[PDB]
Every structure is written in C-alpha cells, then in structure tokens.
Amino acid sequence: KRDEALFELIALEEKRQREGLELIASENFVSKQVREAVGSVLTNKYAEGYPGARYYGGCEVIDRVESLAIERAKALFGAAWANVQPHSGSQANMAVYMALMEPGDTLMGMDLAAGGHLTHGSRVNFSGKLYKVVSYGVRPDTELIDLEEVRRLALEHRPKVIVAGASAYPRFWDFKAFREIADEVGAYLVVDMAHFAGLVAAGLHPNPLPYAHVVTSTTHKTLRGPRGGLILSNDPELGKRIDKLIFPGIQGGPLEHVIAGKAVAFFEALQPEFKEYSRLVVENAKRLAEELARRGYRIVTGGTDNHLFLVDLRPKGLTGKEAEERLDAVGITVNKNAIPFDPKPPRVTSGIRIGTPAITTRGFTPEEMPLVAELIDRALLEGPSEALREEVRRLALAHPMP
C-alpha cells in the first residue's frame, strides 16, 4: 500500500514551493541529483567510525563515498582536514565546542539580537547552558562589528573559544583581526561560515580557513547542498580530536545517504557554473537592496557584501511582524529581524531579513530585482490583494525550480 495521505501532502508542498517567492536568507533549492543521493539505499548502512576504521562489516563502498565527500570538501575549501558526518550545523558546532571546551568554560560569540546564531551562546541553547557566555554585537553608530570592543571583551573575559560568523550579518568579516584577538588571549577562533559557505566556495567571500583554528558550516544554505553539517580545518591534529567528538562523542551512525548528497553538492560547487551562480546571488542581493532603498526603505549598514540584507522598515512606519504578515499574504516569504538597537521588542522588530540564494537558484537575474522590489513595496503599502498574490504566483511559476 502507498501512503497516499502523506504523499498528497508532499505534492502540496511541491506546489507551494513552485508558486511563491522564497526570500528567507537561509533557504535554497537542492538539485535533483542531490535529492537522488539523499533518497538512496545508503541510509541502510550503519557505519560508525571513519573510512577504513569502522565498527561494522560491509562498509567498503560507504568508505569510498565518505572519503570522496571528504576529499572534495578539502579541495573545494582549501582545507587539510574535513569531517562530513555532522547531522546539522548545530551538531558541527556542538562537536567543536565539546572538543575545545569543558562545561563551565567561557564561550564568546555574536549576540542573537545582533545577528548571531542560537549556537553562539543563547541561554536557551546548549551553547549558553553548558558554557559561560560573553557576547559581542554591533556598534550603534556604524551597525557593524567593533573589533576594538571584541578585543576589549576578550581581554576582560579570557574566552576559551571565540566564534566569528553569524546568521544575519550583512557584511564581510575581518578573520585576520579575529585571529589576532584570539591569539592575544589564548583562545581558539572558530568560524561558523554556515550562511556564507557557498560564497566562500566560489571565492566571493574571504576564506576563513587560514585564520580559524576550526571552521564549521551547514551544507545547505548558500552552499546549496543537502541539509546537514560540515567541519574543516588546516590543522589535522585538531581534526583528529574533533573526529572523536563527532563519534563516539555526540553522534552514533552517520547519515551516509546525506554524505553522498554532500559529495554531490561539493561536485556541483567545484564546477565553474557554481561561481557564476554565486556571483549572481551577490549581485541580486546588492541590487534588490538598492531597489528597495530607492523606493523608500533604509538598508542596515547601507547595503550588503553577501547574499542577505536587512531592511529597516521605520521610514514607512511598519514593524517586521506586520511586514512579514503582509508579504506572506501575497506569497512572498521573508522573516522579521531586529535592526541594531531596535526600538521594538523581539517579537515585533522594525526590520526584515531578505536573502537571494533561493530565487537566484530559480533563475532570477539582477535586471529582475526592480520588479521584485516593486512587488514587495506594493504588498507593504497596499496590503494583500488577490491580484497581487496572482502576479507573484505567475512570476514564481515563470522561474522554474530545480
């Protein structure tokens, strides 16, 4: 018997994805071959351990798959060591923190309200439960990280680990300065590149590998791979320590079908086509930010260096929650996001976050960003209408999904 109730929902989700504009910055659409690998029989194999050093028979082919994912990751990112087993970006961070720190040690990371991730020290996350947390944010007058304040905080608190990277920070990172600061206090520098890993792979974002002691990431988001995690380093001895925390430390059997999907995603990113895709992501984001500024919004930090930007909605008197709702009503998905020193509480906010990776995967190009900006503005100014929902639906449908 086919599970028809479940597959009816999958068909509805396929239709939903085709018929709207996905502007949430973390999203992307994986290729059919990434899906083919993830849906493979490799899920059937228990393969605890590492290639050639497994706790089960029968892993000869799985070992070739996992080694292929590892070697491609090292080639793609210019790394000396990789671990491709983390089930998610959160598990990548967890293994690294547990390899470098004991509970009670001090972790330094970007404040959630300023753009940091839950795993960078939030009190409701294991990162802020197991470790003492020092957070850094952005300057009120620049909207940017203040390296002098990062350094001041690190000297005062002597973190064991400093995390650079974020989920909602629209500019480049000074990885060299972060490593200088970590060196001054004897901390490890961990770079969580999840959001911008595709741009690093494409050479369109500074590469953190030479400066970080360890780099963590998601394989999804701008890298456009299957949902899962990744760890990289230029230090294979540190790598051996982290391998032990992934297994037997915090995971059991790895998802070898997902690892096969990671090998496919790395294959795709090693092709020259991926650099052009990534160039268009960055150009779409800059252009869309510019076109919204021309229509009367303000862009936090004035713009963006990467795939995402933050819209300050105060020129038009809207909250992030209101804007989210109005845009959802016409099939445009964004997410509310606090602006620096936001005057509104976090369930409300004064901003939204937009990213271009997903629409760029569907073939949107920079000359189409004025129209996207116009439709966003109309939704915000006019509120929802059937006509605007259908214009968005036609536009989405005209940009086929992988």
Ligand X SMILES: Nc1nc2c(c(=O)[nH]1)N(C=O)[C@@H](CNc1ccc(C(=O)N[C@@H](CCC(=O)O)C(=O)O)cc1)CN2
46 binds ligand KOU (CB under 6 A): yes
Stretch of 29-37, 111-119, 375-383, 389-397 lying at the interface with ligand X (CB under 6 A): 111-119
Given 122, 222, 234, 284, the residue binding ligand X (CB under 6 A): 122
346 binds ligand X (CB under 6 A): yes
Given 171, 179, 195, 224, the residue binding ligand KOU (CB under 6 A): 195
27 in Cβ contact with 281 (< 8 Å): no
224 binds ligand KOU (CB under 6 A): no
Kind of pairing, strands 132-136 and 106-110? parallel
Task: Report DSSP state, residue 311.
Answer: E
- Choose the one of ligand X, a copy of itself, ligand KOU, none that binds residue 20, judging by a C-beta under 5 to 8 angstroms depending on kind: a copy of itself
Q: Which is nearer to ligand KOU, 222 or 284 (CB)?
A: 222
The SS3 of residue 303 is: coil
Residue list 17-76, contact with ligand X (CB under 6 A): 48, 55
360 binds ligand KOU (CB under 6 A): no
Residue list 64-93, contact with ligand KOU (CB under 6 A): 88-90, 93
- Token pair, residue 266, equals 């790395």
Q: Which is nearer to a copy of itself, 174 or 325 (CB)?
A: 325
Sequence-separated (6 or more) residues with CB below 8 Å from residue 225: 30, 34, 219, 261, 262, 264, 265, 266, 268, 269
Q: How wide is the angle at C-alpha 277 spanned by C-alphas 197 and 71, nearest 5°?
A: 45
Residue list, annotated binding site: 46, 89-90, 112, 116-118, 167, 195, 220, 237, 253
- Choose the one of ligand X, a copy of itself, ligand KOU, none that binds residue 250, judging by a C-beta under 5 to 8 angstroms depending on kind: a copy of itself
Catalytic residue positions? 46, 48, 192, 218, 221, 227
CA distances from 109 to 24, 163, 178, 179, 248 (A): 23, 5, 11, 14, 27
- Give the burial string for 316-348 (b: 16+ CB within 10 Å, else e): eebbbbbbbebbeebbbbbbbbbbbebebeeee
Cα separation, 360 vs 374, in Å, equals: 17
Cα separation, 115 vs 355, in Å, equals: 14
Given 106, 337, 350, 356, the residue binding ligand X (CB under 6 A): 337
Residue 150 phi/psi, 5-degree rounding, is -55, -45
- Choose the one of ligand KOU, ligand X, a copy of itself, none that binds residue 115, judging by a C-beta under 5 to 8 angstroms depending on kind: ligand X
Residues at the contact surface with ligand KOU, assessed by CB under 6 A: 26, 46, 48, 88-90, 93, 117, 119, 165-167, 192, 194-195, 218, 251-253
